[PDB]
A = this chain, B = another copy of it.
Amino acid sequence: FLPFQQFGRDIADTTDAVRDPQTLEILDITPCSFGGVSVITPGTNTSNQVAVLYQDVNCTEVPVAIHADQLTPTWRVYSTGSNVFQTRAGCLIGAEHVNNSYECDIPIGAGICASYQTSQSIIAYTMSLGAENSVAYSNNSIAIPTNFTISVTTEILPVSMTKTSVDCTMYICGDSTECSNLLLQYGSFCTQ
């Protein structure tokens, strides 16, 4: 900091750092609630168990990043535990990691999907792309069908929507002449 400069600011013109008046050292300020939190859950009416993803954090440093010492106990159980799993997306807590690959049920990210399974609990895994298959290619081999089938598939396409219509005067003012008179100053918003 230059001698005449007291505050520093970032791109957003929010104060980024402060020079402490008493001890001339510079301190950066960072928000308390850094880090998104996403809840993975089966739908209610089935179970109330859930798992939590903390995005772009190390599972060693999840508690300090989330300020786990300050939360309530029911968040602290999900702050750290035995079901901690690291993924390219972040740290997942509350779901046991499974080696077996399955089709995606609830997507988390970075190839990771979870589901609810009965071991009655939530599981997280790397999705299965489909059955691994190999092809018996050769320069003098053909594979010819001898029987067939006729299949029927359903293709659903939306075509239209509800033909909504709106009267400005009722929604905005509600049959009040004075409010409509003030509204007329705005002009052709409502005709538009």
Contacts and interface: CB of A to CB of B under 8 A. Distances in A.
Interface string A27-42: 0000111001000000
Dominant secondary structure at the A interface: loop
A31 B175 contact: yes
Contacts of A169: 33
B175 A32 contact: yes
Nearest to A165: B36
A174 interface: yes
Interface string A170-192: 10001100000000000000000
Contacts of A14: 174
Indicate how many identical chains form the complex. Answer: 3
Interface residues of A, number: 11
B165 A31 contact: no
Contacts of A170: 31, 33
Nearest to A38: B165
A167 interface: yes
Interface string A131-172: 000000000000000000000000000000000010101100
Given A32-B175, A33-B169, 6 more contacts: A14-B174, A31-B170, A31-B175, A33-B170, A33-B175, A36-B165
Pick the 9 closest A-B CB pairs, nearest first.
A31-B175, A32-B175, A33-B175, A31-B170, A31-B174, A36-B165, A36-B167, A33-B170, A14-B174
